[PDB]
């Protein structure tokens, strides 16, 4: 029975999540965007 | 459901020799100890005359590269057989008291870091997987008492 | 003496701080009951 | 200077994700139990 | 139920008076025995250790006293039959033993006399009392009934048996006596002034420590007669641990001059109140002892808290405790590491405990007086502003809700930062984020010539990046000397010899030529990773401490800064010259380069010596707030910032139930909405209606405050004792803490394990550990929603046992009924068990010794 | 619990030692009893029993912060190290009883799983003194702060680790009842350290 | 650990403490019925399972 | 055993999460639900005022 307000919060937390993942797994498995490589 | 498998990653192993899985080799005792004996002795000479042509020459290439980084082989401090040298204080791996009072995990960092004055650090010479193999070979030197 | 006075004043200012905060909430929500 | 800014951004995101997640647990608790 | 409710207020003045006097006499007797247990024939224990630094500062305990005594007051003093000074003539006694003995006997004689006199006021109140009711287990002895039926303390008797001839204070016609508690406020503080004078005269003339500015030019020491300013600590003013002359108000002669300063002030404020005693309408209801009891007990609690803070700072580095570290302290056969700081920490944490317990209890006793006003219909009639200011329920919900919010935000900030940096120190990969550790690599001196293989990116700033290993012109992987690292380089974790971070491969250089603001005087390449070192600055106390300190030390700070700047330039030019050497290619060009670093070596040496010595000086400047184990400046740490946020947030978490006691003892907003009213101050619930209602009463709110406060109290214990509170997993021996000159014993969880290595060395400490753990978890049997189960099952047990008794013939078993705790008495004993279980274990953390580096 | 502790052993004097120096042992600034009735017996007695280097040490003096405290640079002079058995015993038993008993036992034969056992001859013969320093300084095994054998490079000084090294060689060939005594240290030192 | 399971098997409706009072447990998961008789939390079958 | 557990950073993360799940059960098991209901109610009023 979710609100728009809540959906939107959920989208915003999905973004942080994926932004984080991209930074963690993209340089490692492609050897590019080398500022986030570890 | 959860572990759809389990995402633990791919295993780190040593160098690849064509036609013979290195990852597999790193869990198969008779393969890993053959590479440990080569590192330990600094030559391929004490390897079973049954060794294949490709194997015998891959080892040599491994040694030749390590000789350019001033790698010092384990035998001959510690000898080809253990139980080193009292002169140099080089550890005797044949001794059961030395073997009981070491864990294999603990032994690892003493090879990585070196140990007091003379036993050299191997962290910049060898990979941590090649140190694991050597800890396993040193285990087989033990004698009773 | 210096450290003693600082600590003491920092605890006393911890209470004084809170009251001020509470005073701001009370004044600026006068005429909204909280039911 | 630039490490610091980068670190502040990660910490913000963590607070947004953990506090954000906690409140979603409450909302979800609320929808199940009732409204 | 009522067994702990025997004596409830209001009481009459003579009965309170008399019991206080009797308790005072009793304490004086216990202290007298503690004086006997301080004598030098005994082992060190916790009781005699917590008094020895004070008895050293007083001159009564003398550490350098070796001679044995054989005649001192009267001709019978080596040793003799039936002791000669009973049970003590067995051992060699010194003069400090005799000084101790005498002060013991003096405290036992005064105490017994005060106990007698208190009893005279207490029982002569009631017109007397018979010997068998005073002692009460004296009529059980046979052939001594007649003895116990005499009447002592009678209003009538001959001089050695009077109590109160007039019956009460109110009836006795001495027209000096004040007649109301506000009027008595004036004589009570003149009286306390007089006590301050007594102490000052005892210190000046009995203990021989006159007041500043009248201290002697000369004082006797074990090495002869010396001048006050060179005589070491117990004798004179020279502090032999810090190597300084003490400030005059940091000696005991300072404390004797304050005896007179405070005594004059109390006498004058008491004479002012004699003439204009307090009279406000806002005060008049406070004559009822139930109401004042709240005021006084909560004030006293605050006084204890302030004793803890004041005593901790004032005495952290004082020679009375450090002197303990020089004696050869052995407890249950061990040998303690830094006993000075251990006993100092015990005394201050003792006081913090007492602080909490009395603020919480004082407020509960407050809520009892208010609840009774509500029961009796008088709350609505009350006239004092100190009640009526808070009568409005809409204001009460705004007070409670905004302190809940302020608590929420400070505790989320602190606990969230702890969680973050423990993630960072552990290198945890979450899929969406890789946490990264702090690592450092020295770039200067000899270390700066060790090489590594470097993966070096092409252009960090643009994506569709790429990198490559650093090579030679022929194509082999070249070794990069730590002096030549750059921001963005990656070095393999394995080659730095790091396991423990298996989810990634490289460490990244994030800053080069880094010099700690406060730490080692070295130059590093660093990975900052996720480690928030800037968070130390998110502390108002960092800035105040460092500002005062900079203002006081500004010239050596300026010369240090300038010596650092000169060394950095000289190191940078050395690295140029070393690089020209390494990249020569012509045996001539090599040789000439080598010639020029050789003639620049001296003066790199000089810039490094200069920098080292200025840094050593700067780090020897006196502390303001944050100190070393010496008494030198340290910069604030992440530890100190987290402590700061945790004190704000965690004391609000603990004290919110006290506000609820104050406002909602009778009706809260939940209650008022249903029209309910709390009928007593201690009911457990009213049952399952509306979901469940356990735990709303003011006695229960009291228990919640105490449990919740366990949390700020453990943060204080961990901080006092040298734990790191800013993460959970921190170890003392790691790169961040050694490069920044930080000593700690732990990391929240990691402290628990690490200190217990020390606890395990002591068999008496481990037996305490076992027991205190048994006490705590049994509290869960009493706090869980479980009492019906327990009563139902205890009924099954009763039945079985009575069956056995009928079958077996055992008359005493045939009517057995096991008692099962009802709900209120369970919550009380469960809280008692939970609290004593935890804080016997916290005692152990202090008692293993103090292990922070000095 | 309180008061009825025992009588103190007459051999443990309380007669006071000199205070720990404020100056760092690693300072480049300026470098590194009476006749009263029983004061000479008490000083002579403190000179054997009361330890001088038991207290945690200044932070600039810890082995990781000392320029000559790394395993590669420390001086293990055998003449200074095995010079005085009183001293090895006075110091190493206090340090060992405090820091090392927890994991290695009250007998020094091993408590924590896989922990060392210092009485074992095979272990004694195959370790250098410099080797023993390395493992105290580094720890043993992989982990944060050392492994299951924790690192001491923040924590202890180079001089404190050296008393530990000499004390540990008194464990050789002893039985599993507590720690080496004063005469174990002395027979160890006579048989060339 | 298994005496609560025997209590489930025999005392799901009435224990002997309930039966002296005439009580009757009305469902398998109720939390209590107390503060009566000192309090009754934890007599249901669900609680005996826990 | 925990000195061996500390040498693995994945197992020490598991150790931390495990401890937190447990002591929170005490919030739910103590005789305290009325206190939690009446405080929650103060919290709701306050948030609605904001
Ligand atoms: C570590 C070695 C050893 C082992 C064998 C051990 C095991 C266990 C077990 C088990 C089966 O393994 C259990 C079940 C257990 C139980 C207990 N132990 Zn325990 N225990 C040991 C040793 C000790 C010791 C010495 C102590 C406890 C103490 C305690 C206590 C804990 C009492 C309690 O409930 O305490 C809450 C407080 C805690 C956890 C301390 C928090 C410290 C921290 C610095 C506070 C600041 C930061 C926080 C994140 C909070 C911020 C927000 C806030 C301020 C509002 C009970 C008996 C106890 C204690 O922590 O009391 C506060 C104590 O002193 N224990 N303990
Ligand atoms: C801090 C949180 C944390 C992190 C970062 C990890 C990370 C890891 N876990 Mg642990 N784990 C945790 C907490 C964590 N876990 C907790 C609370 C439990 C108890 C439920 C476990 C129980 C656990 C088991 C039993 C195992 C791991 C394994 C793993 C690994 C592979 C995980 C994976 O495939 O995910 C993807 C999978 C999901 C997201 C769910 C499917 C990885 C090292 C595996 C491993 O072998 O590592 C050594 C493994 O077997 N996890
Ligand atoms: C020390 C641990 C401890 C012990 C010994 C007990 C004992 C018992 N509990 Mg309690 N309980 C505990 C903790 C413990 N509990 C905890 C932590 C909780 C919360 C979850 C509970 C919650 C609880 C519930 C809801 C109920 C019980 C019940 C019972 C009884 C079970 C009936 C029986 O089978 O007899 C067998 C008896 C035994 C197996 C115990 C032998 C006794 C011990 C080990 C000796 C005790 C030593 C004692 C600590 C030392 C202090 C003594 C001092 C003088 C030296 C039993 C007497 C039931 C009951 O019937 O109530 C009356 C019940 O319904 N328990
Ligand atoms: C297993 C139980 C046990 C044993 C055998 C001891 C033994 C002792 N305790 Mg410890 N103690 C214990 C439990 C124990 N305690 C518990 C549970 C606590 C927490 C309340 C303490 C708190 C404690 C303190 C604070 C002190 C000791 C002290 C002592 C010693 C003097 C005892 C004494 O005077 O007794 C006579 C005692 C009575 C006759 C009861 C009064 C003795 C070594 C003293 C000491 O210094 O130790 C080295 C001391 O200062 N006890
Ligand atoms: C983690 C432990 C924890 C936390 C965070 C809380 C939180 C709270 N308790 Mg509960 N409680 C606990 C454990 C906890 N409690 C335990 C062990 C007991 C047994 C005694 C209780 C018993 C209990 C009672 C009887 C009562 C409460 C009440 C409260 C509230 C006080 C009102 C307030 O102060 O606002 C300030 C808020 C804070 C200070 C906390 C901020 C949020 C925290 C820090 C972190 C969130 C952490 C969580 C573990 C994260 C998981 C998130 C997920 C995304 C991973 C607050 C919501 C009172 C209340 O009003 O009821 C609602 C109350 O009456 N507590
Ligand atoms: C228990 C659960 C509830 C979760 C708890 C843990 C949660 C971890 C915290 C996660 C924090 C989120 C990280 C967000 C973030 O900014 O970090 C990722 C970021 O990535 C940047 C780039 C951006 N492009 C490429 C899109 C332009 C990317 O990867 O996509 O790099 C950083 O922020 C690194 C910061 C540098 C540190 C110095
Ligand atoms: C605080 C300590 C320092 C000790 C205090 C003094 C006593 C120490 C030694 C133990 C004393 C044990 C006495 C137990 C006893 O006899 O209890 C009887 C009692 O009451 C019933 C009648 C009185 N009606 C009820 C008639 C008025 C009576 O005897 O006086 O009880 C209780 O109801 C309490 C329960 C006592 C525990 C006894 C249970 C013993 C276990 C037996 C189980 C197995 C069978 C088969 C042997
Ligand atoms: C290993 N050694 C660590 C300490 O080294 P070192 O010597 O460098 O430094 C002082 C800190 O030691 C203290 O001095 C603690 C004493 C604890 C007893 C004292 C602990 C009591 C603290 C607070 C008591 C609160 C009570 C009264 C509610 O480091 C300080 O700066 C502490 C200053 C404390 C002031 C913080 C201010 C916060 C405000 C609180 C508001 C609360 C309310 C609104 C409800
Ligand atoms: C009857 N229905 C009506 C209401 O009942 P209601 O809740 O009032 O009643 C009782 C009694 O008040 C006590 O509570 C007595 C202790 C007070 C001073 C105490 C007197 C003696 C004990 C303490 C003193 C001993 C020392 C000083 C000699 O019912 C109970 O609490 C019954 C439970 C106790 C039965 C023993 C259970 C285990 C024994 C303790 C072991 C636990 C340990 C591991 C810590
Ligand atoms: C206090 C300072 C000490 C001293 C002087 C020593 N220890 Fe320990 N230790 C522990 C474990 C698990 C081992 C085995 C390590 C392994 O093989 O896995 C050890 C080992 C040692 C050694 C031998 C080192 C060597 O290379 O051979 C030495 C000299 C040593 N220890 C001395 C465990 C722990 C602890 C548990 C946490 C603690 C604390 C200590 N040790 C402390 C000390
Ligand atoms: C001499 C020049 C050496 C070469 C080459 C190698 N090692 Fe060594 N080692 C040497 C000495 C003098 C010592 C004694 C160390 C000391 O205590 O002072 C050792 C020690 C070891 C040990 C035992 C370590 C332990 O912790 O207890 C191992 C496992 C060991 N050495 C292994 C080893 C390996 C695998 C080497 C080649 C890869 C190797 N050593 C080289 C001397 C020398
Ligand atoms: S379980 Fe106990 S506290 Fe909870 S509603 Fe029932 S009687 Fe009340
Ligand atoms: Ca401690």
- 3-state SS string for E92-149: CCCHHHHHHHHHHHHHHHHHHHHHHHHHHHHHCCCCCEEHHHHCCCCCCCCCCCHHHH
Q: Where are the domains of chain B?
A: 22-140
CATH superfamily name and code, B22-140: Cytochrome c-like domain (1.10.760.10)
E244: part of which helix (H) or strand (E)?
A: strand E244-245
Ligand nearest to the CA of E428: 2
Report d(CA E333, CA D1) in Å as an integer: 54
* Residue F19 lies inside a defined structural domain of this protein: no
Helices and strands counted in chain F (H then E): 8, 0
Strand order in the sheet with E524-527: E439-442, E524-527, E511-514
Judge whether E530 and D7 are in contact, CB under 8 Å: yes
Please give the number of the atom of ligand 6 that sits closest to the Cα of D3: 38
By the CB < 8 Å criterion, does E439 face chain A?
no
How many CA atoms, within 13 angstroms, populate the side-chain half-sphere of residue E412? 16
E524: part of which helix (H) or strand (E)?
A: strand E524-527
Report d(CA E568, CA E611) in Å as an integer: 10
Phi, psi (deg, nearest 5) at residue E668: -110, 175
* Residue F122 lies inside a defined structural domain of this protein: yes
* Residue F5 lies inside a defined structural domain of this protein: no
Range of the domain at F111: 38-191
* Residue F151 lies inside a defined structural domain of this protein: yes
Which of helix, strand or coil describes residue E703? helix
By the CB < 8 Å criterion, does E5 face chain A?
no
Judge whether F132 and B91 are in contact, CB under 8 Å: no
Phi, psi (deg, nearest 5) at residue E814: -85, -10
Report d(CA E639, CA H50) in Å as an integer: 34
Q: What is the DSSP string of chain H?
A: -HHHHHT-HHHHHHHHHHHHHHHHHHHHHBS-HHHHHHHHHHHHHHHHH-
Resolution in A: 2.6
Report d(CA E65, CA E59) in Å as an integer: 11
Report d(CA B122, CA B109) in Å as an integer: 9
Nearest-5° Cα angle at E643, E642 to E648: 100
Report d(CA E651, CA E653) in Å as an integer: 5
Report d(CA G40, CA E791) in Å as an integer: 8
Are B127 and E496 in contact (CB < 8 Å)? no
Report d(CA E407, CA C22) in Å as an integer: 13
Q: What is the 8-class DSSP label of residue E483?
A: G
Query: How many CB atoms sit inside 10 A of residue E429's CB?
Result: 19
Are E788 and G30 in contact (CB < 8 Å)? no
| Closest to E357 (Cα-Cα) out of E837, E836, E840 | E836
Distance of CA B21 to the CA centre of its chain: 18
Least Cα separation, residue B128 to chain F (angstroms): 11
| Closest to F161 (Cα-Cα) out of F29, F21, F64, F31 | F64
Which of helix, strand or coil describes residue E154? strand
Judge if the beta carbon of residue E824 lies within 6 A of ligand 4.
no
Is G8 annotated to bind ligand? no
Where b means 16+ CB within 10 Å and e means fewer, F19-43 reads bbebbbbbbeeeeebeeeebbeebb
Residues of chain H with a following break (C to N over 2.5 Å):
none
- The alpha carbon of E748 and the centre of ligand 3 are apart by a number of angstroms equal to 32
Q: In this structure, are strands E467-469 and E506-508 parallel, antiparallel, or unpaired?
A: unpaired
E313: part of which helix (H) or strand (E)?
A: helix E289-315
Q: Using most ligand atoms within 8 A of CB, pick from E825, E826, E830 the residue to mutate for ligand 9.
A: E825
Nearest-5° Cα angle at E233, E231 to E234: 100
Q: What is the DSSP string of E413-459?
A: HHHHHHHHHHHHHHT-B-SS-B----EEEE-STGGGG-EEE-EEES-
Phi, psi (deg, nearest 5) at residue G3: -65, -30
Q: In this structure, are strands E455-457 and E467-469 parallel, antiparallel, or unpaired?
A: antiparallel
Contacts of H49 in chain C (CB under 8 A): 29, 32, 34
Locate all alpha helices (DSSP H) within E665-762, ordered by sequence. Answer: 669-674, 698-720, 735-739, 748-760
Query: How many CB atoms sit inside 10 A of residue G23's CB?
Result: 17
Judge whether E699 and E693 are in contact, CB under 8 Å: no
Query: How many CB atoms sit inside 10 A of residue C27's CB?
Result: 8
Sign of CA dihedral E662, E663, E667, E669: negative
Sign of CA dihedral D28, D32, D33, D35: positive
* A37: CB partners within 8 A, 6+ apart: A27, A28, E457, E490, E506, E508
Question: Quick one: chain F helix, strand, coil %, rounded to 5?
Answer: 40, 5, 60
For position F93, which CATH number holds? 1.10.760.10
- The beta-strand segments (E) located in B1-145 are none
Sign of CA dihedral E554, E557, E559, E562: negative
Nearest-5° Cα angle at C21, C18 to C24: 150
Q: Please return the burial class of H22, using the count of CB atoms within 10 Å of its CB with bins 0-12, 13-18 and 19+.
A: exposed
Least Cα separation, residue F58 to chain H (angstroms): 27
Judge whether E317 and F10 are in contact, CB under 8 Å: no
Helices and strands counted in chain A (H then E): 1, 0
Judge whether H49 and C34 are in contact, CB under 8 Å: yes
Phi, psi (deg, nearest 5) at residue E641: -60, -40
Q: In this structure, are strands E511-514 and E524-527 parallel, antiparallel, or unpaired?
A: antiparallel
Query: How many CB atoms sit inside 10 A of residue G20's CB?
Result: 11
Report d(CA B107, CA E456) in Å as an integer: 33
Nearest-5° Cα angle at F138, F133 to F142: 140
* Residue F28 lies inside a defined structural domain of this protein: no
* Ligand 10 pocket list (CB less than 6 A): B 102-103, 105-106, 110; E 757; F 99-100, 102-104, 112, 114-116, 127, 132, 135-136, 140-141, 148-150, 152, 164; H 3
Judge whether E18 and E119 are in contact, CB under 8 Å: yes
Is F135 annotated to bind ligand? yes
| Closest to B112 (Cα-Cα) out of F135, E403, E495, E656 | E495
- The alpha carbon of E825 and the centre of ligand 12 are apart by a number of angstroms equal to 14
Query: What CA dihedral angle connects E418, E424, E427 and E431, to 10 degrees?
Result: 90
Sign of CA dihedral E85, E86, E87, E91: positive
Which of helix, strand or coil describes residue E226? strand
Judge whether E69 and E94 are in contact, CB under 8 Å: yes
End-to-end CA distance of chain B: 52
Judge whether E40 and F1 are in contact, CB under 8 Å: no
| Closest to E372 (Cα-Cα) out of E9, E696, E703 | E9
Report d(CA E467, CA E445) in Å as an integer: 29
Q: Which of residues 68-107 of F touch E (CB under 8 A)?
A: 94, 97-99, 101-103
What total number of domains does chain F contain?
1
Distance of CA E279 to the CA centre of its chain: 39
Are B113 and E496 in contact (CB < 8 Å)? no
Which of helix, strand or coil describes residue F132? helix
Report d(CA E667, CA E371) in Å as an integer: 10
Paired with E455 in beta bridges are E469, E490
Report d(CA F11, CA F48) in Å as an integer: 10
Report d(CA E116, CA E627) in Å as an integer: 49
Distance of CA E31 to the CA centre of its chain: 23
Report d(CA E184, CA E178) in Å as an integer: 5
| Closest to E424 (Cα-Cα) out of E739, E647, E715, E736 | E736
Distance of CA B77 to the CA centre of its chain: 15
Which of helix, strand or coil describes residue D29? helix
């Amino acid at each position: 029975d979710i609100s728009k307000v809540a959906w939107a919060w959920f989208g915003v937390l999905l973004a942080i999540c994926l932004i984080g993942a991209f930074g963690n797994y993209v340089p490692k498995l492609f050897v590019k965007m080398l500022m986030f490589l570890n | 459901v959860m572990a759809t498998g389990c995402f633990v990653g791919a295993r780190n192993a040593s160098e690849p020799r064509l036609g013979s899985s290195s990852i597999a080799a790193s869990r198969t005792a008779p393969a890993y100890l053959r590479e440990a004996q080569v590192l330990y002795e600094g030559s391929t000479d004490g390897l079973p005359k049954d060794t294949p042509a490709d194997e015998i020459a891959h080892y040599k290439a491994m040694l030749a590269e390590l000789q350019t980084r001033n790698y010092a082989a384990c035998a001959g401090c510690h000898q080809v057989n253990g139980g080193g040298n009292k002169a140099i204080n080089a550890t005797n791996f044949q001794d059961a008291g030395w073997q009981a009072n070491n864990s294999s995990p603990g032994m690892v960092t003493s090879i990585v870091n070196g140990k007091g004055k003379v036993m050299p650090a191997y962290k910049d010479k060898l990979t941590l997987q090649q140190i694991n193999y050597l800890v396993e070979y040193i285990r087989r030197f033990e004698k009773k008492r | 003496m210096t450290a003693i006075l600082l600590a003491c004043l920092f605890v006393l200012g911890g209470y004084a701080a809170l009251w001020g905060i509470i005073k701001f909430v009370v004044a600026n929500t006068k005429d909204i009951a909280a039911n | 200077m630039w490490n610091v800014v980068g670190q502040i951004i990660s910490v913000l995101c963590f607070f947004i994700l953990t506090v954000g997640t906690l409140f979603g647990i409450v909302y979800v608790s609320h929808l199940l139990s009732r409204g | 139920k009522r067994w702990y409710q025997k004596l409830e207020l209001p009481m009459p003045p003579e009965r309170i008076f008399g019991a206080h006097m009797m308790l005072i006499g009793g304490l004086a007797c216990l202290i007298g025995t503690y004086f006997f247990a301080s004598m030098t024939m005994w082992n060190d224990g916790y009781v005699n250790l917590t008094l020895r630094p004070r008895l050293i500062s007083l001159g009564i305990y003398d550490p350098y006293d070796t001679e044995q005594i054989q005649r001192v007051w009267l001709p019978l003093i080596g040793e003799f039959s039936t002791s000669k000074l009973p049970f003590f003539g067995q051992y060699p006694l010194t003069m400090t033993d005799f000084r101790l003995f005498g002060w013991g006997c003096f405290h036992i004689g005064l105490g017994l006399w005060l106990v007698y006199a208190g009893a005279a006021h207490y029982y002569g109140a009631r017109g007397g009392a018979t010997i068998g009711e005073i002692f009460w287990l004296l009529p059980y002895v046979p052939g001594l009934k007649g003895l116990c039926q005499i009447k002592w303390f009678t209003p009538e008797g001959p001089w050695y048996k009077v109590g109160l001839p007039w019956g009460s204070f109110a009836n006795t016609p001495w027209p000096i006596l004040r007649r109301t508690y506000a009027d008595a406020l004036s004589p009570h503080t003149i009286y306390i002034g007089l006590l301050f004078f007594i102490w000052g005269f005892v210190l000046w003339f009995v203990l021989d420590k006159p007041p500043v500015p009248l201290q002697p030019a000369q004082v006797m020491t074990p090495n002869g007669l010396m001048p006050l300013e060179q005589a070491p600590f117990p004798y004179g003013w020279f502090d032999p641990y810090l190597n300084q002359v003490m400030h005059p108000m940091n000696t005991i002669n300072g404390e004797t001059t304050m005896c007179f300063v405070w005594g004059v002030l109390f006498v004058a404020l008491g004479a002012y109140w004699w003439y204009r005693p307090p009279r406000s309408i806002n005060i008049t209801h406070l004559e009822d002892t139930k109401a004042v009891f709240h005021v006084h007990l909560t004030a006293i609690g605050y006084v204890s808290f302030a004793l803890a803070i004041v005593g901790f700072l004032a005495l952290r580095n004082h020679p009375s405790y450090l002197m303990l570290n020089d004696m050869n302290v052995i407890i249950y056969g061990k040998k303690i590491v830094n006993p000075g700081r251990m006993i100092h920490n015990m005394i201050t944490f003792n006081h913090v405990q007492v602080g909490l317990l009395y603020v919480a209890a004082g407020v509960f006793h407050g809520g009892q007086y208010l609840h009774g006003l509500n029961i009796s219909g008088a709350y609505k009639q009350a006239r004092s502003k100190f009640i009526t200011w808070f009568q409005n329920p809409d204001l009460q919900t705004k007070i409670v809700g905004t302190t809940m919010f302020v608590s929420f935000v400070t505790v989320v900030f602190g606990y969230g930062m702890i969680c973050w940096n423990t993630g960072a120190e552990l290198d945890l990969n979450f899929g969406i984020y890789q946490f990264r550790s702090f690592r450092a690599i020295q770039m200067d001196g000899e270390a700066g010539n060790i090489g590594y293989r470097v993966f070096r990116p092409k252009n960090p700033w643009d994506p569709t990046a790429g990198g490559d290993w650093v090579k030679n012109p022929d194509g082999t992987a070249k070794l990069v000397k730590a002096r030549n690292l750059q921001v963005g380089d990656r070095i393999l974790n394995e080659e730095l010899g790091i396991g423990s971070s298996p989810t990634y491969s490289f460490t990244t250089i994030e800053e080069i030529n880094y010099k700690p603001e406060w730490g080692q005087p070295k130059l590093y390449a660093v990975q900052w990773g996720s480690w928030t070192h800037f968070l130390r600055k998110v502390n108002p106390l960092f800035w105040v401490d460092k500002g005062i300190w900079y203002l006081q030390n500004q010239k050596t700070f300026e010369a240090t800064r300038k010596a650092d700047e000169a060394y950095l330039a000289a190191h940078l030019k050395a690295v140029s010259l070393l690089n020209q050497i390494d990249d020569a290619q012509t045996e001539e060009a090599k040789q000439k380069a080598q010639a020029e670093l050789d003639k620049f070596r001296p003066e790199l040496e000089k810039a490094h010596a200069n920098m080292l010595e200025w840094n050593e000086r700067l780090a020897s400047t006196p502390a303001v707030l944050y100190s070393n184990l010496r008494d030198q400046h340290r910069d604030g740490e992440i530890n100190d910032a987290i402590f700061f946020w945790l004190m704000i947030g965690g004391w609000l978490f603990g004290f919110i139930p006290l506000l609820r006691i104050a406002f909602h003892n009778y009706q809260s907003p939940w209650y008022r909405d249903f029209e309910w009213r709390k009928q007593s101050p201690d009911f457990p619930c009213i049952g399952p209606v509306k979901g469940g209602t356990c735990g709303v009463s003011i006695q229960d709110q009291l228990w919640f405050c105490i449990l919740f406060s366990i949390k700020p109290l453990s943060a204080i214990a961990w901080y006092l004792d040298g734990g790191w509170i800013a993460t959970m997993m921190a170890r003392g021996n790691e790169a961040y803490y050694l490069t920044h000159n930080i000593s700690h014993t732990g990391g929240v969880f990691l402290y628990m394990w690490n200190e217990t290595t020390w606890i395990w060395t002591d068999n008496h400490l481990t037996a305490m550990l076992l027991l205190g753990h048994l006490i705590w978890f049994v509290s869960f049997a009493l706090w869980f929603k479980d009492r019906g189960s327990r009563a139902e099952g205890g009924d099954i047990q009763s039945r079985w046992v009575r069956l056995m008794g009928k079958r077996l013939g055992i008359k005493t078993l045939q009517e057995v009924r096991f008692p099962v705790s009802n709900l209120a008495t369970a919550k009380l004993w469960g809280t008692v068990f939970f609290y004593t279980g935890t804080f016997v274990l916290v005692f152990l953390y202090f008692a293993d010794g103090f292990f922070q580096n000095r | 619990g309180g008061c009825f502790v025992g009588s103190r052993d007459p051999n443990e004097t309380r007669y006071p030692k000199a205070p720990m120096p404020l100056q760092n042992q690693t300072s480049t600034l300026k470098t590194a009893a009476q006749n009263t009735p029983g004061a000479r017996e008490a000083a002579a007695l403190r000179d054997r029993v009361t330890p001088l280097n038991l207290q945690q040490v200044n932070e600039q003096d810890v082995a990781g912060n000392d320029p000559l405290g790394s395993p590669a640079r420390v001086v293990l002079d055998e003449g200074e190290m095995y010079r005085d058995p009183v001293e090895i015993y006075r110091e190493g038993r206090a340090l060992f009883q405090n820091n090392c008993v927890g994991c290695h036992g009250h007998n020094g034969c091993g408590n924590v799983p896989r922990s060392t056992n210092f009485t074992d001859p095979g272990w004694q013969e195959n370790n250098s003194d410099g080797g023993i320093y390395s493992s105290i300084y580094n720890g043993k095994g992989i982990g944060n702060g050392g492994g299951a054998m924790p690192a001491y490079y923040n924590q202890l000084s180079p001089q404190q680790i050296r008393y530990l090294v000499a004390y540990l060689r008194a464990f050789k060939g002893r039985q599993c009842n507590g720690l080496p005594t004063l005469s174990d240290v002395e027979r160890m030192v006579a048989e060339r350290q």
